[PDB]
Amino acid sequence: MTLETTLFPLEGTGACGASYQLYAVKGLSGLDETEYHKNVNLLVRRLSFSMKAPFVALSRDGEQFIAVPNYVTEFPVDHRVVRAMVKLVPTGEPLNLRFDAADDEYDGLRLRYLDFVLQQPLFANHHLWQPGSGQPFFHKKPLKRLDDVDLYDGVSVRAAKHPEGGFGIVCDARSKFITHTPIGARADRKRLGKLINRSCLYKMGDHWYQFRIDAVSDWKVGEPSLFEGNVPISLAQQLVRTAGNAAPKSIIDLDPEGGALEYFTSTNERRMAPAELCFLIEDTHGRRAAKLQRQTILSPSERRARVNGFIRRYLSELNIGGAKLSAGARAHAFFTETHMPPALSFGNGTVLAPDTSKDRFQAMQEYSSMRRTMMLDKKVGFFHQDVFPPQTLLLPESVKKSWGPAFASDFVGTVQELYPAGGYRPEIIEYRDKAYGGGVPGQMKALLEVAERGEIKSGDVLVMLHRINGAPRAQDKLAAMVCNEFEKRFGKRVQVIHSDSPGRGYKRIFKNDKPTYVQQRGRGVNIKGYLKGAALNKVCLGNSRWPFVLRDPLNADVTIGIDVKNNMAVFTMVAEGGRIVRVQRSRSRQREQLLESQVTQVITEMLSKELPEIKKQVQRVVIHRDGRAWPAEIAGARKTFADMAESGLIAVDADVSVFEVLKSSPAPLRLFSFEEPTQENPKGVINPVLGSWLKLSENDGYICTTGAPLLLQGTADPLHVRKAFGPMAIEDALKDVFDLSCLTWPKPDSCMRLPLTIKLCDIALFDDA
DNA sequence: TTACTGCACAGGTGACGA
């Protein structure tokens, strides 16, 4: 119940002045509403970088109004490029914003100013450095040396509203891996060329920052490559005359034969840096270094200690102009109620309820384990139990000729034990995986040829693919193409598994004077665990056999997720308790945004199909957007339900609310709870329990969809959800985000960070050609 | 096959810097 945040109060913010002059923009009156705001923030960005001041957008009614810090003297007022030229006309009457007010619509302006100015004292601190604007502040001294690489520890700092009045800071600890020795003056042109698109740390004397390698310079560090006025000058000479005071040796004594890297400014200009002073950023996710990556996962005690250390060390005096500022010693804390997980419905009339006579941790551990054990028990089992329609299992020819048959026997038996009512009995087909080439073309050619001959009877196909890209941070192009083509050209619905994972589960054995494949249980995969998980996710869930659903209504009757990435929009709908659930794809104009018409079409048709199955009059609707929400999207959403309320398909006074689910949060906040201090945990800091939550304002809140009993390591990352429109209170939306995240269908005995709504999108999220 | 913890890559309402 006792919970603490990483929100620190701000002190001395009396006598703080945020002077803006509003302007407004003509441009062309073609408010494309999808091209309009694009250009709005393109110009805001351009001005913020060129003039280096905190330009903001405040969008009232017309949604124009760039806000210009009044302390810039010469202002272009007219701005070129950006399609038709834009004229900036002031709305007179300068603003002088203060931090002791009630809730205004100028709060975005204050937060922008506060963010901008809080990072001058840290930018000036000799012992800190920042990769780039907005990013966290890391110590120059590494936290640790791991062999060839250094582990740097930093803290991110964002301004925010304080729920007990005023403004504060939300911070989080952060990590970065950088190779210890530099690229070096002795590295030749071929080596540097092989580094294009890596990022590196540049120790330009006392000023450290990070940039993306874009090309290799033709001129060496000592050869003339610049102009000082009209005299051609070397990079060495330029770095010398921009050093000051007692400049370090490294910047004034470069090897003249060393090479230089090239990069782009934020304002899009060309610059050089000597390789002698650049240290490659290391990717611990790619080139999968488990031992290194584990160093970045912090216990709650480690996290709290590092965050508070940074606060007390660098945020106790903070001078900005005549301004004296401080960060409170101790973070905001509260007593809160924690949400209980919802009662769930399983097969045969059985309900699972959290037990309230146990302490919250034990009760949550029992409930989570029970989700799996009730799914498996043939006396209770899946909430939705029916026979499957015909099924196909489509295997590569090379697999069918070796270990395919043994895998299929085991998989079929595993499905029948997990879901005894389906009578799973797939027809096994092969495709010629070696006949054409084994890139994405050629695999696709063999899959399509098998589909053309009519060999895939039935509409459900489970297809085993080869893994073309084994590197992480890689989308499965082949799987996306297979789903898209089998849906578009045939009626097929396709789930995917790969060949590497199960193949590691089987070894060839001599039995009865015959070669046979049998299970091997050493290492590389846990084959039983694989068979069970793939049976659940690819066959049961893939045929929409939900193992359990909510017993009680959410605050929302219907709730709809949206994600647009790769010109591939995904709409999702959960209704009743998760008894309805649908998922549609759509080809969007842009890669990551939606036209208002497309929204108001897909949603209307999708919901009209299901409305006769929704046996309660519908009156509250919620949309969960995965990421930023655009107002063309909001307009379409409001229009859909105003129309359906007029018609009578819905309650005449039904309402809509829209919420962005920010999984990477721009203001990352953490929650801690406390136990009795043990010898290992001298302060007794621990994770918050699963249902914990907090709202900072009417528009910003946090739920722990992950938390204490079910996390094995690290500290929980609370989920940030922010309202964008509508009458639903933020607390109610937090509660049923949490209830929707207890529908842990992919892995019943575990916690799950995203609510089921957006969980559907980010797995069905695919590619377009 | 799947769950979280993590960084980064891009990819961003974003100030620096040869």
Residue numbers in the entry: 1 to 769
Lines quoted from the article behind this entry:
The structure of the binary complex of PliAgo with P-gDNA shows the path of the DNA molecule and its contacts with the MID, PIWI, N and PAZ domains of the protein. The 9th and 10th nucleotides of P-gDNA, which define the cleavage site on target RNA, are positioned in front of the catalytic site of PliAgo. Along its length, guide DNA is oriented within PliAgo through multiple contacts between the DNA backbone and positively charged amino acid residues. These contacts pre-order guide DNA in a nearly A-form conformation from the 1st to 6th nucleotides in the seed region, thus making it optimal for target RNA recognition. The 3D structure of PliAgo in complex with P-gDNA reveals that the 5′-phosphate group is coordinated by residues R467, H498, S501 and Y530, resulting in positioning of the 5′-end DNA base (1T) next to the side chain of Y530. In accordance with biochemical observations, there are no sequence-specific contacts of the 5′-end nucleotide base with PliAgo. In contrast, in PliAgo the 5’-end nucleotide stays outside of the MID pocket and forms stacking interactions with the second nucleotide of guide DNA. The orientation of the guide 5′-end in the complex of PliAgo with P-gDNA differs from all previously characterized Ago-guide complexes, shifting the register of guide DNA by one nucleotide toward the guide 3′-end. As a result, the 1st and subsequent nucleotides in guide DNA in the PliAgo complex superimpose with the 2nd and subsequent guide nucleotides in previously studied pAgos.
Argonaute proteins are programmable nucleases that have defense and regulatory functions in both eukaryotes and prokaryotes. Here, we describe a new class of pAgos that uniquely use DNA guides to process RNA targets. The biochemical and structural analysis of Pseudooceanicola lipolyticus pAgo (PliAgo) reveals an unusual organization of the guide binding pocket that does not rely on divalent cations and the canonical set of contacts for 5’-end interactions. Unconventional interactions of PliAgo with the 5’-phosphate of guide DNA define its new position within pAgo and shift the site of target RNA cleavage in comparison with known Argonautes.
